[PDB]
Design a protein around this ligand. Structure first.
Ligand code: CLA
Ligand code: CLA
Ligand code: CLA
Ligand code: CLA
Ligand code: CLA
Ligand code: CLA
Ligand code: CLA
Ligand code: CLA
Ligand SMILES: CC1=C(/C=C/C(C)=C/C=C/C(C)=C/C=C/C=C(C)/C=C/C=C(C)/C=C/C2=C(C)CCCC2(C)C)C(C)(C)CCC1
Ligand SMILES: CC1=C(/C=C/C(C)=C/C=C/C(C)=C\C=C\C=C(C)\C=C\C=C(C)\C=C\C2=C(C)CCCC2(C)C)C(C)(C)CCC1
Ligand SMILES: CC1=C(C/C=C(\C)CCC[C@H](C)CCC[C@H](C)CCCC(C)C)C(=O)c2ccccc2C1=O
Lengths: 753, 46, 80, 137, 139, 65
C-alpha cells in the first residue's frame, strides 16, 4: 500500500509560446538582454533546474523528462554507428579476413582534396580506419552481414522516437508526484532485478542461442555464407545438438538441478581463445548468466509492500556507536542517522555518488578490457586496444570530477545543519582541518618520493653515474607486493596453492601463465613489473592524491573557511570576495572544481602515457616462427622511462614521428589535429593568465569606434565574467591537450599497429 | 504556429541558417571549380 | 589599516552598511540628500578590504571607496 | 624585371610536380590552369608577385570583389542597427531578427559604395566627438 | 566578566588558536526563546540553549556573520552583542557600538572620513608629490 | 531642467559622460544632487538611474508639450 503510483494529468500545456521567450526559466533572464552577459547567462543556467523553481516535485519531473531526452540522443548516436557500419564500411570484408583488414566505417567526400583521408584499409575499401572496436563488438554478438546492422540501425531510430515521446508524456501529460521519486526500496528492487538482472539474463540468452553457435562456426573456419542465420539455430534444434550435445536433452537438466550437463556451452575455462585472442564466449555466457541470478536475487533485498525486506532508514539509523565494531565506534553515537534526509531531498548528492561510481566502472572497463580482451581480434588490433583504454580512462576522470563538483553543490545548496547534529557528516566537517592538513602532507611526501626521484635519476644519468640511479641495475625499487599478487593469481589456476582449481587457463595472461598470439602479433603476455613500474605507479598515487586534495578541500570548505566564513551565502559559483583579507580569489567550491579539472587532466595523461609506452615496450609486437617476440619499441620502458628525459626523447619525440610526418598521406588529418590541439592549448592560456578588467577596458575603446560610426549595438558588449573566463580557459585547455594526445595516439597506432 | 515562426528568427537560428547556406555555396564552388587561386579566378579552363 | 571614504554623492540608501561583514560603516544624520543620512566609517581598523560596500553602492560613480593600505592581523582576515 | 620568377609552364621543377601529381579531380584541371597563368619560383610552386604592371587585374579583381562583399555585410549591419535605434526595445530586435527590416537593409546595401559616399558628404556617416561616451582623461 | 552559557558543541578544528590567547579574542552573546540548532561560523552544527548564550570566536567577522545572517535573519534574535576580549582580561563591547544597529540612523553619530566633494574632483597625484598626502585625503 | 527633459551628462567620472538621459524628477529641496536622470543603457553595475546637479547637465531637448 505504501508503494503506489500517483501522478497529475496535464500539468504543463504543450505550447511553443515559451520557445520565443529565451530565459523564461529564470526571473532575472526573463526580462531580456541588456548586455552580452545575458546571452552567456542564458546557456549557463539552462539546465540548473533547482534555480528555475523551489518546488522539489517540479524539479524531479524535469529530471525524469530530460533523462528520456538524453536516452533518445544516445539512441540516435547508436543508430548512426550501426548504419555507418552497414552502408559506408568494409565490415563484410573484415569478417572474411579479420587479421588482414583494418576496420573502417567513415568515408569522406571528394571536394577539397580531403579524399586523401580515405586510407587503404584493405578489403578493396577506402576510408578512415576506425578505432572504436565496433566490428569486434558485432562479431562477438554473432552479426555477420550488413543487413543485420541495418536492422539494428532502424531499431535504434525507433527507440529514439519512443524515448522522446516518453519524456514529453511524463512531463506534459502524466507527471509523477514527489513521493513517487522517493521510493528508494521500489527503485532499488526494480533496477537490480529488472534492469541489471533481466538484461544480463536476456543477453545470456542471446549469447547462448546466437553468439555461441555463430562464433563457434567462425572460429572453426566455416565461411560466412555457410553459417546459418541466427534464427535457424533456434528452429532447427539438431543444429545446436551438433555444436553442443547438451542441447539434445532440452531444459530437463536445468529444472532438475543437474546443471553439470550444461558444461559444454557454459564453460569455466579462463584464459583466451587461441584462434581470436578474445575471451571464450561460452565463458562470458556463464558469466552473464551467473550475474543475472545474482542481480535478481539482489533485487529482493528491499521492503516495498509485503513486509519482507530491509529498510534504508532503519539500516542507516542503526549504523552508529555502540552498534559498530569496537574499533569503528569513533563515528559517534549518532553515526549514519540523519543521512536519510539527504537522499529524500538532494538530487545533487545522488548525482555526486553516481558520477563517482561511473568513474569507477569506466576505470574497471579500461583496466579489465586490455588484460582480459573480451572481443575476437581485439587484442591484436593495437590501434583499437589503445583507443578503448584511453577513451574510458578519460570518461572516468571527468565523471569523478563531476561527482566532486555536485558533492560541493549539495553542501552549499541542499545541506541543512539541523538534519546533521553530531552525525558522521557533521563530524567530518568538524575535523576538516585534520583531513586537509594530513592530505596536504601526504601529497608533499608522494611528490618528493615519486617525481623528485625522477629528477634524481636525470641528474645521475647526466653526471655519467648510472650506478647511482633508481633502476633495475642501480638502486632497485622492486614492487614486491604487486609481484607477489601476480604469482598468487597465476598459481591459483595451477599455472596459497591452487585456490581456484576450476579455472583451467590463467584468468589473465598479464599476470603470467604464458603467451597468446593470433595473427603473428601478441594478444597478451605476462607484464613484468620492475623499478620503472614502481616509480610510475607512485606517480599515479601522487597525482591522484593531489587531485583528491583539490576537490575534497573544495567540498569540505564549500560552506566557508577561516578566511571567508559565509561562503555558503555567496553561493557555489562566485569569483571571489574582493581583494581584502590579502586577496580571496578562487575561494568558491566551483573554483576548486576548476582547478581539479587541470589536475585530473595531468593525472590521467600520465596514466594513458604509462599504458601506451609499457604495452608497446613489453607486450605488443610481432612473433616469428620460433616464438621470439620483437616489441613495438623494443623494451625501451625499463631503462628509458626512469628519467623524464627518456620520456621526452624516447616517448614524446620518438613516437610522434608518425603524426609529425603524416602530411601528404592518409594520416594527414591526425597531423592537422595535432597542430589544432596545440593551438587551442596556447589559446586557452590568455583566458587563464589574464583578467576581465583589461578586456572590458579594451572593449571600451572598440565600442567608441563603433559609436563614432553609429554602428554600436544596443546589447552592450561586455568582457566575460571572472568565472566565465576561468570556465573558457579550462575548457579550451583540456580540449587542446586531449585532442593533441588523441591525434598522437591514433596516428602512430594506425601506422604501426 | 506563430510562436514557431518567431522562434525561427532568433539570432542563433538565423546565424546557423546563414552559416549553413554560406557554407553550402562555398562547398559547391569547390566541387564545381576546384583549385581556384589568385591570378586564376574568372579565367577560361586551358 | 585600509581607508574608507564617503563622498557627497551618497543618497543614504544604507546598502553599504548592510553589506559590510565586519561592521565598519554606520548611518549618521545628514542634510545633503533626501534620505537625510550619509554613510560613515568610524571603525576602519576592522575593515578587511572586501569591497562589499562598493558592490552595494548604487550611485555612479561610487559614493564610498576603499583604499587598501597597511595590512594588520585583522585586516588580513587572520584567525591565527 | 624579376628574373627568379618564370612562367610555371617553363619552370622545370613545376612539371616534376605535375607529372607526379595524383590523377584526381583536384589536380588535373588546377595544374593546367597554374601552368598557363601562374608564375613559379625555383621550388616549382606558384608565387604571387605584386611587382608587375601587367596581370594587375589578377590583383584588383579579388581585392575589389572582397571589398564589395565585406562592405555589403558591414553596411547591412550598420543600416539595420540604426533602424532599430528608434524602436522601444532595440535589444530585443538584436536577438530576434526583424525580417522585414533586415531585407530592407540588405537591399539598400547593394549600392553601399554610393550610399557611404553620400553619408560622408552630408556628415551623416559619423557622430560628433562630444556626443560619444568617453572615459575621464 | 561576560556571563552566559555556551552552546552544546562536541568540539571542532575551527575554534580558537594561539591568536586568541596572545593578541585578541571575540565573544558573541545573545538570548534565544528556545533550544534550537544553528550553524557554527567555522563549520559544524551547535545547539543554542534555552537561556542566554555565549560563544567564543576567533574573528569579529564570525560574530557579524552569525548574528546578522543567522540570529537575526533566521532566528529573529535581535539582542546579540559582540565583545573584544584582550589577553589581560580587558573586555569592550563593539557591536552594536551605541546600542543601535549601524544600518539604522541614530542621532549623535558624527561624520567620519567624509569628503565634501564628488569622487571625480580628487586632485592628481602629481600635485601632491613629496607632500605625503593622498588624493582622497586632500582638503 | 525639469521632468521629461532630454539632457546630456557632463559628469566626467559618470558612466554616461557625454551620453543622453531623460529627467525623471527634480527635487525642490536644497539637496546637493536633486535631478534624477534615467538612461536606456545600464552601467557596469546594471543601474540605469543616477542623481545629478544642474551644472552637470546640458539640456538637449525640451519636454514634450
Ligand atoms: C512536442 C513538442 C514540445 C513542445 C511544444 C514543448 C513545449 C514546452 N516544454 Mg517541453 N518537452 C518535449 C516536447 C515539447 N515541449 C519533450 C519531447 C520533452 C522530453 C525531453 C520535453 C521536456 C520538457 C521539460 C523537462 C521542460 C519542458 C518545458 C517546456 C515549456 C517551455 C518551453 C521550452 O522548453 O523552451 C525551450 C525551447 C526550445 C526550442 C529548446 C529546444 C532545445 C532542445 C531541448 C535541445 C536539444 C535536446 C533534444 C531534446 C534532444 C532530442 C532531439 C533529437 C532530434 C536530437 C513549453 C511549454 C519546460 C517547462 O515546463 O517550462 C518551465 C521544462 O522544464 N519540456
Ligand atoms: C524493472 C523495471 C524497471 C526498469 C528496467 C527501469 C529502467 C530504467 N529506469 Mg527506472 N524505475 C522503475 C522501474 C524500472 N526502471 C520504478 C518502479 C521506478 C519508481 C520507483 C523507477 C524510477 C526511475 C527514475 C526516477 C529514473 C529511472 C531511470 C531509468 C533508466 C536508467 C538509465 C539506464 O540505465 O538506461 C538503460 C538503457 C536502456 C536502453 C534500457 C531500456 C529502456 C526501456 C524503457 C526499458 C523497457 C523494458 C521493457 C520491459 C520492454 C522490454 C521488451 C522486451 C525486451 C522484453 C532505465 C531505462 C532514469 C531515467 O533515465 O529515466 C528515463 C530515472 O531518472 N527510473
Ligand atoms: C550526469 C551528468 C551530469 C549532470 C546531469 C549535470 C548537471 C548539472 N551540472 Mg554538472 N558536471 C558533470 C556532469 C553532470 N552535470 C561533470 C562530469 C562535471 C565535471 C566536468 C560537471 C561540472 C559542473 C560544474 C563545474 C557546474 C555543473 C553545473 C551543473 C548544473 C547546471 C547545468 C549547466 O550549467 O548546464 C551546462 C551548460 C553549458 C553551457 C555547458 C556546455 C559547455 C561545455 C563545457 C562544452 C563542452 C565542449 C564539447 C564537449 C567539446 C568541444 C565542442 C566543439 C564545438 C569544440 C546541473 C545540475 C553547474 C551548476 O551551477 O550546478 C548547480 C556548474 O557550475 N557541473
Ligand atoms: C552520431 C550520429 C551521427 C554522426 C556523427 C554522423 C556523421 C556523418 N554521417 Mg550519418 N547518419 C546517422 C548518424 C550520424 N551520422 C544516422 C542515425 C543515420 C540514419 C538516418 C545516418 C545516415 C547517413 C547517410 C545516409 C549518410 C550519412 C553521412 C554522414 C557523414 C556526412 C554527414 C553530412 O554531410 O551531414 C558524416 C561522417 C553521409 C556520408 O557518410 O557520405 C558518404 C551519408 O551519405 N549519414
Ligand atoms: C560485473 C559486471 C559485468 C561484467 C564484468 C561484464 C563483462 C562483460 N560484458 Mg556485460 N553486462 C553487465 C554486467 C557485466 N558485464 C550488465 C549489468 C549488463 C546489462 C544488464 C551487461 C550487458 C552486456 C552486453 C549487452 C554485452 C556485454 C558484454 C560483456 C563483455 C565485454 C566486456 C565488457 O562489457 O566490459 C567489462 C565491464 C567491466 C569490467 C565493468 C563494468 C561492469 C559494471 C558497470 C560494474 C559496476 C560496479 C560499480 C562500479 C560498483 C557499484 C557501487 C557498489 C556500491 C555496488 C564482458 C565479458 C559484451 C559481449 O558480447 O561480451 C563478449 C556485450 O555485447 N555485457
Ligand atoms: C533469458 C533469455 C532466454 C530466452 C528468450 C530463451 C529462449 C529459448 N530457449 Mg533458452 N536458455 C537461456 C536463456 C533464454 N532462452 C539460458 C540462460 C540458458 C542456460 C541455462 C538456456 C538454455 C537453453 C537450452 C538448453 C535450451 C533452450 C531452449 C530455448 C527455446 C525453447 C525454450 C522453451 O520453450 O522451453 C527458446 C527459444 C531449447 C531449444 O529449443 O534449443 C534451441 C533448449 O534445448 N535454452
Ligand atoms: C612542474 C610544475 C609544478 C610543480 C613542481 C608543482 C609543485 C607542487 N604543486 Mg602544483 N600546479 C602546477 C604545476 C606545478 N606544481 C600547475 C601548472 C597547476 C595548475 C593546475 C598547479 C596547481 C596546484 C594545486 C591546486 C595544488 C598544487 C600542489 C603542489 C605541491 C604538491 C606537493 C608536492 O609535490 O611537494 C613536493 C614538491 C615538489 C615535487 C616540487 C619539486 C621539488 C624539486 C623536484 C626538488 C627540489 C630540491 C631542493 C628542495 C631544492 C632547494 C635548493 C634551493 C637552492 C632552492 C607542490 C609544491 C598542491 C599542494 O600544495 O599540496 C600540498 C595543491 O593543492 N599545485
Ligand atoms: C554590424 C556589423 C559590424 C560593423 C559594420 C562593424 C564595424 C567595425 N568594427 Mg566591428 N564587430 C562586430 C560587427 C560589426 N563591426 C561584431 C558582431 C563584433 C563581435 C565579434 C565586432 C568586434 C569588433 C572588434 C573587436 C573590433 C571591431 C572593429 C571595427 C571597425 C573596423 C574593423 C572592422 O570592420 O571590423 C572587423 C570585423 C570584426 C572584428 C568582426 C565582425 C564580424 C561579424 C561576425 C559580422 C557580423 C555581421 C552582422 C551579423 C550582420 C547582421 C545584419 C543583419 C541583421 C541585416 C569598424 C567600425 C575594430 C575597431 O575598433 O576598429 C577601429 C576592432 O578592434 N569590431
Ligand atoms: C554503458 C553504456 C553504454 C550502454 C551499453 C549497453 C549495450 C547496455 C545494455 C543494456 C541492456 C542490454 C539492458 C537490457 C534490459 C532488459 C530488460 C529490462 C528486459 C526485460 C524483460 C522482461 C520484463 C520480460 C518479460 C516477459 C515477457 C515479455 C513475456 C513472458 C513473461 C516475462 C516476464 C518473462 C553505451 C555504450 C551505449 C553508452 C555509454 C554507457
Ligand atoms: C595599391 C595596392 C596596395 C596598397 C594599398 C594601400 C597602401 C592602401 C592604403 C589605404 C589607406 C591609407 C586607407 C585609409 C583609410 C582611412 C579611413 C578613415 C577609413 C575609414 C573607413 C570607414 C569609415 C568605413 C566605413 C564602412 C563602410 C564604407 C562599409 C562597411 C561599414 C563601415 C561603417 C565599416 C596593396 C599592396 C595592399 C595591394 C595591391 C594594391
Ligand atoms: C580574450 C578574453 C576576453 C575577451 C573575450 C570575449 C569578450 C568573448 C568574445 C566571444 C565572441 C564574440 C564569440 C564569437 C567568436 C567566433 C570565433 C566568431 C565566429 C565568426 C564567424 C563569421 C566565423 C575576456 O573577456 C576575458 C574575461 C576574463 C578573463 C579572460 C578573458 C580573455 O582572455
Amino acid at each position: 500500500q505504501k508503494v503506489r503510483v500517483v501522478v497529475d494529468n496535464d500539468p504543463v500545456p504543450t505550447s511553443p509560446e515559451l520557445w520565443a521567450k529565451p530565459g523564461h526559466f529564470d526571473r532575472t533572464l526573463a526580462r531580456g538582454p541588456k548586455t552580452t552577459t545575458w546571452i552567456w547567462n542564458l546557456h549557463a543556467n539552462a539546465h540548473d533546474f533547482d534555480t528555475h523553481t523551489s518546488d522539489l516535485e517540479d524539479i524531479s519531473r524535469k529530471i525524469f523528462a530530460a533523462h528520456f531526452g538524453h536516452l533518445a540522443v544516445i539512441f540516435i548516436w547508436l543508430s548512426g554507428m550501426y548504419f555507418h557500419g552497414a552502408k559506408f564500411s568494409n565490415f563484410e570484408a573484415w569478417m572474411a579476413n579479420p587479421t588482414g583488414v583494418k576496420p573502417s566505417a567513415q568515408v569522406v567526400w571528394s571536394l577539397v582534396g580531403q579524399d586523401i583521408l580515405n586510407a587503404d584499409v584493405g578489403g578493396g575499401f577506402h576510408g578512415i580506419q576506425i578505432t572504436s572496436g565496433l566490428f569486434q563488438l558485432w562479431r562477438a554478438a554473432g552479426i555477420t552481414n550488413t543487413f543485420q546492422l541495418y536492422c539494428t540501425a532502424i531499431g535504434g531510430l525507433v527507440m529514439a522516437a519512443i524515448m522522446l515521446f516518453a519524456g514529453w508524456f511524463h512531463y506534459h501529460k502524466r507527471a509523477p508526484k514527489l513521493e513517487w521519486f522517493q521510493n528508494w526500496e521500489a527503485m532499488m528492487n526494480h533496477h537490480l532485478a529488472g534492469l541489471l538482472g533481466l538484461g544480463c539474463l536476456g543477453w545470456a540468452g542471446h549469447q547462448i542461442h546466437v553468439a555461441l553457435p555463430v562464433n563457434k562456426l567462425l572460429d572453426a573456419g566455416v565461411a560466412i555464407k555457410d553459417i546459418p542465420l541466427p534464427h535457424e539455430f533456434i528452429l532447427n534444434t539438431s543444429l545446436m545438438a551438433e555444436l553442443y550435445p547438451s542441447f539434445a536433452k532440452g531444459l530437463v537438466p536445468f529444472f532438475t538441478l543437474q546443471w553439470g550437463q550444461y558444461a559444454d556451452f557454459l564453460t569455466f575455462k579462463g584464459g583466451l581463445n587461441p584462434v581470436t585472442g578474445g575471451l571464450w564466449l561460452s565463458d562470458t555466457a556463464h558469466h552473464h548468466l551467473a550475474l543475472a541470478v545474482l542481480f535478481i536475487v539482489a533485487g529482493h533485498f528491499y521492503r516495498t509492500n509485503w513486509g519482507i525486506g530491509h529498510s534504508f532508514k532503519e539500516m542507516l539509523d542503526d549504523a552508529k556507536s555502540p552498534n559498530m565494531l569496537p574499533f569503528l565506534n569513533f563515528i559517534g553515537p549518532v553515526g549514519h542517522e540523519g543521512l536519510d534526509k539527504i537522499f529524500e531531498t538532494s538530487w545533487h548528492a545522488n548525482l555526486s555518488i553516481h558520477l563517482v561510481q561511473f568513474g569507477t566502472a569506466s576505470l574497471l572497463v579500461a583496466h579489465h578490457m586490455y588484460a582480459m580482451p573480451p572481443y575476437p581480434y581485439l587484442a591484436t588490433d593495437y590501434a583499437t586496444a589503445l583507443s578503448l583504454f584511453t577513451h574510458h580512462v578519460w570518461i572516468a576522470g571527468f565523471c569523478i570530477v563531476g561527482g566532486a563538483a555536485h558533492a560541493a553543490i549539495f553542501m552549499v545548496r541542499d545541506y541543512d545543519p539541523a538534519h546533521h547534529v553530531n552525525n558522521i557528516l557533521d563530524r567530518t566537517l568538524r575535523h576538516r582541518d585534520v583531513i586537509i592538513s594530513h592530505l596536504a602532507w601526504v601529497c608533499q611526501f608522494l611528490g618528493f618520493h615519486s617525481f623528485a626521484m625522477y629528477c634524481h635519476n636525470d641528474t645521475m644519468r647526466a653526471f655519467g653515474r648510472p650506478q647511482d640511479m633508481f633502476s633495475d641495475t642501480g638502486i632497485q625499487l622492486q614492487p614486491i607486493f604487486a609481484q607477489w599478487i601476480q604469482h598468487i593469481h597465476t598459481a591459483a589456476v595451477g599455472a596459497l596453492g591452487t585456490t581456484a582449481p576450476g579455472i583451467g587457463a590463467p584468468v589473465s595472461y598479464a599476470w603470467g601463465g604464458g603467451m597468446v598470439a593470433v595473427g603473428g602479433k601478441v594478444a597478451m603476455m605476462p607484464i613484468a613489473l620492475g623499478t620503472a613500474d614502481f616509480l610510475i605507479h607512485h606517480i599515479h598515487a601522487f597525482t591522484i592524491h593531489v587531485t583528491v586534495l583539490v576537490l575534497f578541500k573544495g567540498v569540505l570548505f564549500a560552506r566557508g573557511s577561516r578566511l571567508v566564513p559565509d561562503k555558503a551565502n555567496l553561493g557555489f559559483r562566485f569569483p571571489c570576495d574582493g581583494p581584502g583579507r590579502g586577496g580571496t580569489c578562487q575561494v568558491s567550491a566551483w573554483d576548486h572544481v576548476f582547478l581539479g579539472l587541470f589536475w585530473m587532466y595531468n593525472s590521467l595523461s600520465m596514466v594513458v602515457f604509462h599504458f601506451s609506452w609499457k604495452m608497446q615496450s613489453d607486450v605488443w609486437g610481432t612473433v616469428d616462427s620460433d616464438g621470439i617476440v620483437t616489441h613495438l619499441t623494443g623494451g625501451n620502458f625499463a631503462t628509458s622511462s626512469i628519467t623524464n628525459n627518456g620520456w621526452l626523447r624516447d616517448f614524446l619525440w620518438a613516437q610522434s614521428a608518425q603524426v609529425i610526418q603524416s602530411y601528404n598521406s592518409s594520416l594527414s588529418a591526425y597531423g592537422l589535429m595535432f597542430l589544432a590541439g596545440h593551438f587551442i592549448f596556447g589559446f586557452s592560456l590568455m583566458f587563464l593568465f589574464s583578467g576581465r578588467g583589461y578586456w572590458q577596458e579594451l572593449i571600451e575603446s572598440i565600442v567608441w569606434a563603433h559609436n563614432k560610426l553609429k554602428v554600436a549595438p544596443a546589447i552592450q558588449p561586455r568582457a566575460l565574467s571572472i568565472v566565465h573566463g576561468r570556465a573558457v580557459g579550462v575548457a579550451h585547455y583540456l580540449l587542446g591537450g586531449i585532442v593533441t594526445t588523441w591525434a598522437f595516439f591514433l596516428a602512430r597506432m594506425s601506422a604501426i599497429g | 504556429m506563430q510562436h514557431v515562426f518567431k522562434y525561427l528568427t532568433l539570432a542563433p537560428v538565423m546565424a546557423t541558417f546563414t552559416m549553413v547556406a554560406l557554407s553550402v555555396v562555398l562547398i559547391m564552388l569547390q566541387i564545381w571549380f576546384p583549385g581556384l587561386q589568385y591570378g586564376t579566378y574568372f579565367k577560361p579552363t586551358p | 589599516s585600509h581607508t574608507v571614504k564617503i563622498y557627497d554623492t551618497c543618497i543614504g540608501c544604507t546598502q553599504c552598511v548592510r553589506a559590510c561583514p565586519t561592521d565598519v560603516l554606520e548611518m549618521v544624520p545628514w542634510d545633503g540628500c533626501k534620505a537625510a543620512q550619509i554613510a560613515s566609517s568610524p571603525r576602519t581598523e576592522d575593515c578587511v578590504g572586501c569591497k562589499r560596500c562598493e558592490t552595494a553602492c548604487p550611485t555612479d560613480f561610487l559614493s564610498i571607496r576603499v583604499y587598501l593600505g597597511a595590512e594588520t592581523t585583522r585586516s588580513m582576515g587572520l584567525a591565527y | 624585371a624579376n628574373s627568379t620568377l618564370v612562367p610555371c609552364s617553363k619552370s622545370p621543377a613545376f612539371q616534376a610536380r605535375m607529372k607526379n601529381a595524383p590523377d584526381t579531380y583536384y589536380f588535373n584541371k588546377p595544374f593546367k590552369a597554374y601552368a598557363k597563368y601562374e608564375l613559379c619560383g625555383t621550388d616549382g610552386l606558384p608565387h604571387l608577385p605584386l611587382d608587375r604592371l601587367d596581370r594587375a587585374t589578377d590583383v584588383l579583381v579579388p581585392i575589389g570583389l572582397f571589398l564589395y562583399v565585406a562592405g555589403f555585410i558591414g553596411w547591412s549591419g550598420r543600416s539595420y542597427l540604426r533602424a532599430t535605434k528608434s524602436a522601444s526595445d532595440p535589444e530585443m530586435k538584436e536577438i530576434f531578427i526583424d525580417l522585414p527590416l533586415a531585407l530592407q537593409s540588405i537591399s539598400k546595401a547593394v549600392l553601399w559604395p554610393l550610399l557611404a559616399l553620400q553619408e560622408f558628404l552630408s556628415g551623416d556617416l559619423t557622430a560628433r566627438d562630444e556626443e560619444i561616451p568617453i572615459s575621464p582623461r | 566578566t561576560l556571563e552566559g552559557q555556551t552552546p552544546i558543541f562536541g568540539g571542532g578544528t575551527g575554534g580558537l588558536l594561539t591568536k586568541a590567547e596572545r593578541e585578541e579574542k571575540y565573544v558573541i552573546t545573545w538570548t534565544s526563546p528556545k533550544e534550537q540548532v544553528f550553524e557554527m561560523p567555522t563549520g559544524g552544527s551547535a545547539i543554542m540553549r534555552q537561556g542566554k548564550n555565549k560563544l567564543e570566536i576567533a574573528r569579529k567577522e564570525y560574530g557579524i556573520a552569525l548574528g546578522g545572517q543567522q540570529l537575526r535573519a533566521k532566528f529573529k534574535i535581535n539582542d546579540y552583542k559582540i565583545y573584544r576580549v584582550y589577553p589581560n582580561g580587558e573586555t569592550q563591547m563593539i557591536h552594536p557600538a551605541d546600542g543601535v544597529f549601524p544600518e539604522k540612523v541614530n542621532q549623535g553619530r558624527p561624520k567620519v572620513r567624509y569628503v565634501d566633494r564628488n569622487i571625480g574632483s580628487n586632485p592628481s597625484p602629481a600635485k601632491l608629490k613629496f607632500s605625503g598626502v593622498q588624493p582622497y585625503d586632500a582638503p | 531642467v525639469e521632468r521629461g527633459s532630454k539632457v546630456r551628462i557632463l559628469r566626467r567620472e559618470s558612466y554616461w559622460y557625454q551620453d543622453v538621459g531623460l529627467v525623471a524628477s527634480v527635487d525642490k529641496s536644497g539637496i546637493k544632487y536633486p535631478v534624477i536622470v534615467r538612461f536606456d543603457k545600464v552601467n557596469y553595475a546594471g543601474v540605469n538611474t543616477n542623481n545629478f546637479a544642474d551644472f552637470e547637465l546640458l539640456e538637449i531637448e525640451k519636454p514634450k508639450a
